[PDB]
Short mmCIF file of C-alpha atoms in Angstrom, two decimals:
data_model
loop_
_atom_site.label_atom_id
_atom_site.label_comp_id
_atom_site.label_asym_id
_atom_site.label_seq_id
_atom_site.Cartn_x
_atom_site.Cartn_y
_atom_site.Cartn_z
CA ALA E 1 -64.25 -82.11 27.74
CA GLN E 2 -60.80 -81.41 26.32
CA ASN E 3 -60.41 -82.32 22.65
CA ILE E 4 -57.40 -84.48 21.77
CA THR E 5 -55.90 -85.59 18.42
CA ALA E 6 -53.11 -88.18 18.03
CA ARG E 7 -51.41 -89.87 15.06
CA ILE E 8 -52.08 -93.59 14.55
CA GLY E 9 -49.05 -95.77 15.27
CA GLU E 10 -47.50 -93.18 17.57
CA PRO E 11 -47.64 -93.04 21.32
CA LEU E 12 -49.77 -90.83 23.56
CA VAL E 13 -49.79 -89.92 27.26
CA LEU E 14 -52.84 -88.73 29.18
CA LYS E 15 -51.81 -86.86 32.32
CA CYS E 16 -53.96 -87.82 35.29
CA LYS E 17 -54.79 -84.57 37.08
CA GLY E 18 -54.00 -84.09 40.76
CA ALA E 19 -52.38 -87.51 41.14
CA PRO E 20 -49.15 -88.01 43.17
CA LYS E 21 -46.06 -88.83 41.06
CA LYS E 22 -45.26 -92.18 42.69
CA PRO E 23 -47.54 -94.69 44.50
CA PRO E 24 -49.56 -95.01 46.71
CA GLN E 25 -52.21 -93.37 44.49
CA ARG E 26 -56.00 -93.54 44.55
CA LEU E 27 -56.71 -93.39 40.80
CA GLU E 28 -59.05 -95.00 38.27
CA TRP E 29 -58.98 -95.09 34.47
CA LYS E 30 -62.24 -95.53 32.60
CA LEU E 31 -62.15 -95.77 28.80
CA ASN E 32 -64.78 -95.94 26.06
CA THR E 33 -63.37 -96.76 22.62
CA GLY E 34 -63.58 -99.19 19.73
CA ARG E 35 -61.83 -101.97 21.63
CA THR E 36 -64.31 -101.77 24.52
CA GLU E 37 -68.07 -101.22 24.43
CA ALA E 38 -68.90 -99.52 26.54
CA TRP E 39 -66.66 -98.99 29.59
CA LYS E 40 -63.54 -100.86 30.74
CA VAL E 41 -61.35 -100.37 33.81
CA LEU E 42 -57.75 -101.46 34.27
CA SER E 43 -55.82 -102.86 37.21
CA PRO E 44 -52.17 -101.83 37.64
CA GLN E 45 -49.36 -103.68 35.85
CA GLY E 46 -50.03 -107.38 35.23
CA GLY E 47 -49.95 -110.23 32.73
CA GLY E 48 -53.27 -109.15 31.23
CA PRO E 49 -53.21 -108.35 27.48
CA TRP E 50 -54.01 -104.66 28.08
CA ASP E 51 -50.44 -103.79 29.08
CA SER E 52 -49.57 -103.97 25.39
CA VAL E 53 -52.47 -101.69 24.47
CA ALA E 54 -52.85 -99.14 27.30
CA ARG E 55 -51.30 -99.16 30.76
CA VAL E 56 -50.75 -96.87 33.73
CA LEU E 57 -47.30 -95.46 34.43
CA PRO E 58 -45.69 -94.90 37.85
CA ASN E 59 -46.30 -91.25 37.01
CA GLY E 60 -50.00 -92.12 37.24
CA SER E 61 -50.67 -91.16 33.63
CA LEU E 62 -52.12 -93.61 31.11
CA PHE E 63 -49.89 -94.43 28.15
CA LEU E 64 -50.57 -96.31 24.93
CA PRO E 65 -47.60 -97.32 22.74
CA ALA E 66 -49.46 -97.56 19.44
CA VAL E 67 -52.60 -95.45 19.22
CA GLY E 68 -54.79 -97.06 16.57
CA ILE E 69 -58.20 -96.49 15.01
CA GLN E 70 -60.15 -98.52 17.57
CA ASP E 71 -58.90 -96.14 20.26
CA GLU E 72 -61.13 -93.23 19.27
CA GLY E 73 -63.53 -92.31 22.04
CA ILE E 74 -63.60 -91.14 25.65
CA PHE E 75 -61.00 -91.44 28.40
CA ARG E 76 -61.85 -90.61 32.01
CA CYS E 77 -59.67 -90.50 35.12
CA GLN E 78 -60.93 -89.86 38.66
CA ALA E 79 -58.26 -89.11 41.27
CA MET E 80 -57.97 -88.69 45.04
CA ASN E 81 -55.48 -86.89 47.28
CA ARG E 82 -55.06 -87.95 50.91
CA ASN E 83 -57.26 -85.08 52.07
CA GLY E 84 -60.04 -86.19 49.73
CA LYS E 85 -59.65 -83.41 47.17
CA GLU E 86 -61.35 -84.78 44.06
CA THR E 87 -59.69 -83.92 40.76
CA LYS E 88 -61.11 -85.46 37.59
CA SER E 89 -59.98 -85.62 33.94
CA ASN E 90 -62.20 -85.94 30.89
CA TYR E 91 -60.37 -86.74 27.64
CA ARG E 92 -62.07 -86.97 24.24
CA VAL E 93 -59.74 -88.81 21.88
CA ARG E 94 -59.74 -88.76 18.08
CA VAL E 95 -57.07 -90.37 15.90
CA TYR E 96 -55.75 -89.15 12.55
CA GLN E 97 -53.33 -90.17 9.81
CA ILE E 98 -51.71 -88.27 6.94
CA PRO E 99 -51.63 -90.00 3.51
CA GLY E 100 -48.81 -90.18 0.98
CA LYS E 101 -48.09 -87.20 -1.26
CA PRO E 102 -51.04 -86.88 -3.70
CA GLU E 103 -49.80 -88.14 -7.05
CA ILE E 104 -51.61 -87.67 -10.35
CA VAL E 105 -52.01 -90.57 -12.78
CA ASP E 106 -53.42 -91.03 -16.30
CA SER E 107 -52.50 -87.40 -16.98
CA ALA E 108 -52.60 -85.80 -20.44
CA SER E 109 -49.87 -83.73 -22.11
CA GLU E 110 -52.06 -82.17 -24.79
CA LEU E 111 -55.73 -81.23 -24.88
CA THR E 112 -58.03 -79.67 -27.48
CA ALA E 113 -59.98 -76.43 -27.04
CA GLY E 114 -63.18 -78.05 -28.27
CA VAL E 115 -64.56 -80.96 -26.29
CA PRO E 116 -64.29 -82.02 -22.64
CA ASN E 117 -60.94 -83.66 -21.96
CA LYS E 118 -59.78 -85.87 -19.08
CA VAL E 119 -56.90 -83.98 -17.43
CA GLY E 120 -56.07 -86.82 -15.05
CA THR E 121 -56.94 -88.74 -11.90
CA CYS E 122 -55.72 -87.51 -8.50
CA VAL E 123 -54.92 -90.26 -6.00
CA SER E 124 -54.34 -90.16 -2.24
CA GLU E 125 -53.50 -93.36 -0.35
CA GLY E 126 -53.85 -94.19 3.33
CA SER E 127 -55.59 -91.33 5.14
CA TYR E 128 -57.86 -90.79 8.14
CA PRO E 129 -60.39 -89.38 7.90
CA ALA E 130 -61.00 -89.24 4.13
CA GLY E 131 -60.84 -85.49 3.57
CA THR E 132 -61.30 -83.59 0.32
CA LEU E 133 -59.38 -83.53 -2.99
CA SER E 134 -59.48 -80.09 -4.59
CA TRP E 135 -58.07 -79.17 -7.99
CA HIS E 136 -56.47 -75.80 -8.69
CA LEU E 137 -55.95 -73.55 -11.70
CA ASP E 138 -52.99 -71.15 -11.86
CA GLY E 139 -52.72 -71.18 -8.07
CA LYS E 140 -56.41 -70.38 -7.83
CA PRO E 141 -59.21 -72.86 -6.95
CA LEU E 142 -61.74 -74.16 -9.46
CA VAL E 143 -65.47 -74.94 -9.40
CA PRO E 144 -66.84 -78.27 -10.76
CA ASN E 145 -70.16 -77.13 -12.22
CA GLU E 146 -69.13 -74.25 -14.50
CA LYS E 147 -67.41 -73.08 -16.57
CA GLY E 148 -67.17 -76.20 -18.74
CA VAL E 149 -65.74 -78.18 -15.83
CA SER E 150 -66.46 -81.67 -14.46
CA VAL E 151 -65.26 -83.86 -11.56
CA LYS E 152 -65.63 -87.60 -10.94
CA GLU E 153 -64.87 -88.18 -7.24
CA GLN E 154 -64.57 -91.44 -5.28
CA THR E 155 -63.68 -92.90 -1.85
CA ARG E 156 -62.68 -96.39 -0.69
CA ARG E 157 -61.61 -98.05 2.57
CA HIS E 158 -59.07 -100.79 3.25
CA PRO E 159 -61.01 -103.50 5.17
CA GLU E 160 -57.91 -104.39 7.21
CA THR E 161 -56.07 -101.18 8.08
CA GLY E 162 -59.21 -99.03 8.08
CA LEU E 163 -57.45 -96.37 5.99
CA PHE E 164 -59.03 -94.42 3.12
CA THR E 165 -58.19 -93.92 -0.56
CA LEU E 166 -59.50 -91.04 -2.67
CA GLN E 167 -59.78 -90.50 -6.43
CA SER E 168 -60.74 -87.28 -8.21
CA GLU E 169 -60.69 -87.48 -12.03
CA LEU E 170 -61.07 -84.03 -13.63
CA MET E 171 -62.46 -83.04 -17.05
CA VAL E 172 -62.30 -79.64 -18.79
CA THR E 173 -63.49 -77.81 -21.89
CA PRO E 174 -61.04 -75.00 -22.77
CA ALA E 175 -62.63 -71.77 -23.98
CA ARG E 176 -61.58 -70.92 -27.53
CA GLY E 177 -58.65 -68.51 -27.81
CA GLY E 178 -57.95 -69.10 -24.14
CA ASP E 179 -54.62 -69.69 -22.44
CA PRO E 180 -52.54 -72.35 -24.23
CA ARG E 181 -50.54 -72.64 -21.01
CA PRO E 182 -52.86 -73.55 -18.13
CA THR E 183 -51.43 -74.98 -14.90
CA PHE E 184 -53.19 -77.69 -12.92
CA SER E 185 -52.62 -78.94 -9.38
CA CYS E 186 -54.60 -81.15 -7.03
CA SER E 187 -54.32 -81.31 -3.21
CA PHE E 188 -55.33 -83.25 -0.10
CA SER E 189 -56.63 -81.27 2.86
CA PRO E 190 -57.99 -82.94 5.99
CA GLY E 191 -60.96 -81.35 7.74
CA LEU E 192 -59.06 -80.55 10.93
CA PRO E 193 -57.81 -76.96 11.50
CA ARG E 194 -54.07 -77.80 11.58
CA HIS E 195 -52.21 -79.58 8.78
CA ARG E 196 -51.84 -77.67 5.56
CA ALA E 197 -52.81 -79.19 2.25
CA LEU E 198 -50.41 -81.52 0.48
CA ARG E 199 -50.21 -80.11 -3.06
CA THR E 200 -49.29 -82.20 -6.07
CA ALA E 201 -46.55 -81.19 -8.45
CA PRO E 202 -48.29 -78.94 -11.01
CA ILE E 203 -48.89 -80.26 -14.53
CA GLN E 204 -49.14 -77.82 -17.42
CA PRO E 205 -50.35 -79.31 -20.73
CA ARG E 206 -51.00 -77.33 -23.91
CA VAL E 207 -54.29 -76.17 -25.44
CA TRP E 208 -54.18 -76.71 -29.21
CA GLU E 209 -56.93 -75.50 -31.51
CA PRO E 210 -58.53 -78.51 -33.25
CA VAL E 211 -57.92 -78.11 -36.99
#
């Protein structure tokens, strides 16, 4: 049943299939989401508190002003022409949100070519879903296990807004006689196959020999 993604706090319209543009219409909207467990059905326009959340338009389509988190789920619409021609619609809804540009904090301007050093802590604020936080070296990706690399990831959730926060502190051990001018960048990339990663502005500290 058709996959659908929509940004939280935006609007969204679900076109009821085979329904006449202006009443009389024989339509029905079922919906399974966070706000209703399991199924709820709506009457046309009225004083009920659902006309702020999701209501049917003259067009016949269902329309929600502010898609939120609790609106992830399943939306069904069964329609009827005068002749009886059934035409149904099965909408699977998932909601997303892009977080602020990934800034680095606690960064370091100089590091030694001897011991592991903390490069910095990457921070992304207000996402959905969480998604990864990958560090990069000279435009190329890096691997946490080897060589002489470490990563200290994390993930929170704001109890109110339901949005996520990610932290990815890095640590490296520069190979002796290696490049004194590395170049590090972090990035947020959601799991979906659309939005590109949000890179951070590259930092490039220096690798001094110890003594």
